[PDB]
Amino acid sequence: SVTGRIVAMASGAGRPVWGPRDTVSLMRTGFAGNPVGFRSVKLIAEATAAVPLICQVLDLLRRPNAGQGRAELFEALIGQILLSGNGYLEAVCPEPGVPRELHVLRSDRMAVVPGADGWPVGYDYTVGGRKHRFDMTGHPDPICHIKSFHPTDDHYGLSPMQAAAVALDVHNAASAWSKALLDNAARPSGAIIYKGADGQGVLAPEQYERLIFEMETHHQGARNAGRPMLLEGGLDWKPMGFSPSDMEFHETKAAAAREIALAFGVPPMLIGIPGDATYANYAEANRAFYRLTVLPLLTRVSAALAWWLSGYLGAQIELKPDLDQVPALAVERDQLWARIGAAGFLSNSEKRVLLGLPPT
Amino acid sequence: SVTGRIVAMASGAGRPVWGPRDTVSLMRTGFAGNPVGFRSVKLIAEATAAVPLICQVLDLLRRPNAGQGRAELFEALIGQILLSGNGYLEAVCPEPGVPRELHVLRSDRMAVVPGADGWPVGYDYTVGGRKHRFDMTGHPDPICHIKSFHPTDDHYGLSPMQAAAVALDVHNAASAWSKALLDNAARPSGAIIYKGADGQGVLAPEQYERLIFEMETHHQGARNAGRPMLLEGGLDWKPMGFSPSDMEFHETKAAAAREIALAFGVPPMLIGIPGDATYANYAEANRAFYRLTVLPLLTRVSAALAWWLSGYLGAQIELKPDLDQVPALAVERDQLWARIGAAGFLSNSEKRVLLGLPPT
Amino acid sequence: AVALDVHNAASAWSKALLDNAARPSGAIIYKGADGQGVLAPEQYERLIFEMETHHQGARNAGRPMLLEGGLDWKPMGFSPSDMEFHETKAAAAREIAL
Amino acid sequence: MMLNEVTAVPGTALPVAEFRDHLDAALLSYLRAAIAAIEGRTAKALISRGFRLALTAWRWGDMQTLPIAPVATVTALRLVDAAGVETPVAAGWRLVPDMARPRIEALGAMLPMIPTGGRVEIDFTAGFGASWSALPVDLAQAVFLLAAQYYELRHDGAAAMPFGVMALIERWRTVRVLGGRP
Amino acid sequence: MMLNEVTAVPGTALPVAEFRDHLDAALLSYLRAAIAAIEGRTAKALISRGFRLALTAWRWGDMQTLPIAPVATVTALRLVDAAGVETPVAAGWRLVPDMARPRIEALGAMLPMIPTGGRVEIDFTAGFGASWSALPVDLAQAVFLLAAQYYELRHDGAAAMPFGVMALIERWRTVRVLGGRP
Amino acid sequence: MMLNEVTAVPGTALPVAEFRDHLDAALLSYLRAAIAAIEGRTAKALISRGFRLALTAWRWGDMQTLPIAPVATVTALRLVDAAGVETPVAAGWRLVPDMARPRIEALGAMLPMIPTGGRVEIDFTAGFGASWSALPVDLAQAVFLLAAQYYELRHDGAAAMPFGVMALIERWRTVRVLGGRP
């Protein structure tokens, strides 16, 4: 905090330090552009929104605003923390306490103003040509800013897409390579070379209509595959090929698809990347998914929500995921019960407390 | 909501902000065009409509309108949320409370008018040249707009087909490549080169009818495979080949088919894409299907229906999927019963409550 | 000490192979009317434009590239692509751990 | 795309005296038989006549480069109808004077839309100069090296100097590497 | 990109006397027919005339190297508008005098932005020297070896000495290995 | 990198008498047309004139080898500014006299930093000797074998002796095997 005095002014005191930028270009060619980046964010965002949260805020969280609900709020929120590394949550509060509505303002239309020392003084929602200038000089601080870990930036976070920015281009360009290879590529099945009496000479239109007819009727099609094609003097048929047919940037596009899923943290088994079986049977692939890139991301967003909403209600509320009621950790849930259930040295009163059950 | 004042006018106050467009071009060449995109939507839409919904609306949902039923309503509804990312549900209501009919208006013939601040003021159903201008300045708000998560758009959703828009073209064009390769391709089994006494010279019609006869009768067909074909002076037979025969854009079409299924979220085992076995025996492939792309999609549409229909009846109704009566989660259902059934430290009264059974 | 040098040098071999290596996808050979002759700047700007706009990129993979008299396109390759000192660097990594 | 010229070179501009000094109705007959041969291989004009590129459909919406290379001051861009309305439009395009791609692009929009059946005809003044003294002297020497050959041998008999007829016009030909869609 | 010269070489600068001694209206006609042939193969100027590179769009923002190689003292960089405003700008660029890449780069920023349709025209004085005695003598010998050939044979007939016309100008041609995007 | 010489060879140093004995305004015209041809193939100077290597950016920080090979006694290393400050610096470099890589390296540090736009110009005296009697006699014989050829045939006609013009200057050419970055 003490260094906040010298870093804020050196970054621009009281002036909008906008986002790293391109935060909207990559959203179109990295999310709405390719299926791997689309399915990766969609897989993480809907899984994070589906995990129940416990309250050691609810009524508000279940029904955030008149539009999106609890599911769509977290999806649209995590969908920003993944696409840009920044998550903003506006709260309007006509009456003191739990604010009425929570809105997920899109992160590419939002800039931070560092202010005087350290912590920002406000936020600027800039759509079109107009701003709004939220205010951070209060106790509620209506904007909650969830940042992914950024090592070199001081006011924003890092997007996992930014790391995979090259793999998304390799995947987009190799997919457009195969498509363009089909749209503009002249593959002839042969050629009727007609040199003529001279070294070079065309054939009259009376000979063209005859030749174009005997080729269309008798030598083209599936029903004409093998006609011996008498070639007179001067005429010739050179059968042409198509040397590279399959697999144009096939593995370099597959390796690129694996590096996009690698950056976002999803195991390639879940989204469907064809590749080596690192996990066995989706029992561990889903368990590793919810353990390495879903709950660690949720335990941060939920922790930021709790500390921000507890600034409105007069309490220091805690809000963590409910690791019990998740179907992805059932493989871990039962092996715990098997260890403590088969343990007879302690009585039933002791193991009910070990497994999280209220004693009887 | 506060930023809704500046974003609505900057997007056009009170004017129809039509759909992203192409929402009808891709429906013809991505759903009615190829089997992978057709089977993917059809698989998700009929599975989502088959899941029972619980009411912690029914009579209405089971018999929506005089035409389509509960099954066809959700299929035609999810079939739009998948094809365009937008789902509209019109409700006509002669008497107060539960509206008589629910209609799924196709999303490419519907546009949103943002209005003054934030939330829209109506919707425009534009068929042919005529509009209707629904009205959103009421409590019932007759149109329920289900949107898939769109990060950069403010009034619509994102279609999983839009992400796979290139993979659908690669699949369509590579399939039309193989078809056109069969319709117009001159494959001769040989050629009878007749140079003649000169460097070049045709053979008289008296020699053509003789040659065309001895080739048809004695040298063509399956019953004539090997005739030694005496070649006189000047005549010659050049056996021609067909170098690339199989597998023209074979793997690039297969990889494209896998990326369409990847975007829609179906495991390639279910629809039938030949590829690596990421899942084992359809017990986990179907369970992962209903867990990653069916129930997460249903728990949003059902949640939007509940909050919209509860605006008609005087209650805040909840409407969620019935995860018990689904055959796809039986593999997960029994492993729960095995863990709590084999747990003897707690009595039968405790485990009946743990498994969701009313005690006795 | 030697396995560390083989591992360091083979890793710097792959890196330097990417930093300074001219891989062209082809070449537009223009001999001309003579045995050798350049093409005027009016023909260069035209040729540099039709190649950039219509024949380069992923969206331009297959354009049939009409070649007039004198012009020619020689598609060039890249013969050793993968695995430059691949196993000798892997065997070196195994001898360091050994 | 027709590209039929309006008025030919009168002949008082062709260098019959200079050609005669290089070595008159026959001399004039071989000068233009060598100009047409060279300007057909290089797609040039060399005397700045007036042409009429009367085509029916634009290849692009910001294009339709002109076939004859050295162009200056497109006179009119007429839009006839199916009956021949012959209405001259005056705005919507601009000539980009280039020796490589002499094109008539646009004014920030599409070309003047062509009536169905109502071909567009463009008339321009394409060439190097009005008098022979304005040509690139290497292209003028190539016309002489060719015309003096047509004059010295009357039928197709046989004989490659360092800078011959070919090596002199090899730098005026059009270099194209597209036989594709755009 | 037009690059049409302003004023030709008057002829009082070309060495008609020295060419005659090497072996007059015909001699002058073969000297310039050999200068144009050699300066079209080497992209040089050799007499330092005045040119006008009137292009419409910069290829870079710190570039637009000039086609003619030996350049000195760009006179003006005019920016016309769509109507021909002909406003001369005076700052924002600098000529980097090189025999390899004669370029007019920048002043720490982009080139003077070109008005839409308002082509930029640059006029410069490119060449070796104003008098024939300033040329590289090997390039001057190549002009003589070629002009003396145009003089001794009038039509394209056939006959490679150690340092011929080609071996002398082979070191003045432009060496380029880019047919790509940048 | 310009490398335009300051003063040419006056001609009183070229061996017009010895060339005439080997076989005068024409003889002098073929001697220098053969010196320029040979010193352009070997990148030598042969008469030790004065040059001006006026470049804009060093290729290294301890380098900028000079193009002309036989160099001695770089006179000055001027650093102009954007306006032409023409301030001569006197320390910071040293010429390494080599026939292979005649370079002006450094004094234990970087070259004198070049002002932005303020090109550096170096003037040196590169060559074998001031008089013709100081040349390597095999390079002097090559000039005679070439000049005597330019004299005996005036246009590019055709005729490889054991030690010809090529075999004599093949050991004075620059041997380079780098077309890369450094």
Numbering used by the authors:
A (entry chain A), B (entry chain A): 24 to 79, 90 to 393
C (entry chain A): 198 to 295
D (entry chain B), E (entry chain B), F (entry chain B): 1 to 23, 36 to 171, 175 to 197
The publication says:
Gene transfer agents (GTAs) are DNA-containing phage-like particles produced by some species of bacteria and archaea. The genes encoding proteins that form Rhodobacter capsulatus GTA particles (RcGTA) are derived from phage DNA, which has been integrated into the bacterial genome. Here, we use cryo-electron microscopy (cryo-EM) to determine the structures of RcGTA before and after DNA ejection, and to visualize the interactions of RcGTA with R. capsulatus cells. Particles of RcGTA have heads with a diameter of 38-nm and 49-nm long tails.
The RcGTA head contains a special vertex in which a dodecamer of portal protein subunits (Rcc01684, g3) replaces a pentamer of major capsid proteins. The structure of the portal complex with imposed twelvefold symmetry was determined to a resolution of 3.3 Å. The portal complex is cone-shaped and contains a central channel with a diameter of 28 Å at its narrowest point. According to the convention established for the portal proteins of phages, the portal of RcGTA can be divided into the clip, stem, wing, and crown domains. A dodecamer of adaptor proteins (Rcc01688, g6) is attached to the surface of the portal complex exposed on the outside of the head and the adjacent part of the RcGTA capsid. The structure of the adaptor complex with imposed twelvefold symmetry was determined to a resolution of 3.3 Å. The maximum outer diameter of the adaptor complex is 143 Å and the minimum inner diameter is 35 Å. The adaptor protein can be divided into four domains: the attachment domain composed of β-strands 1–5, the tube domain formed by α-helices 1–4, the adaptor loop, and the C-terminal hook. Residues 175–197 from the C-terminal hook of the adaptor protein interact with helix α8 from the clip domain of the portal complex.
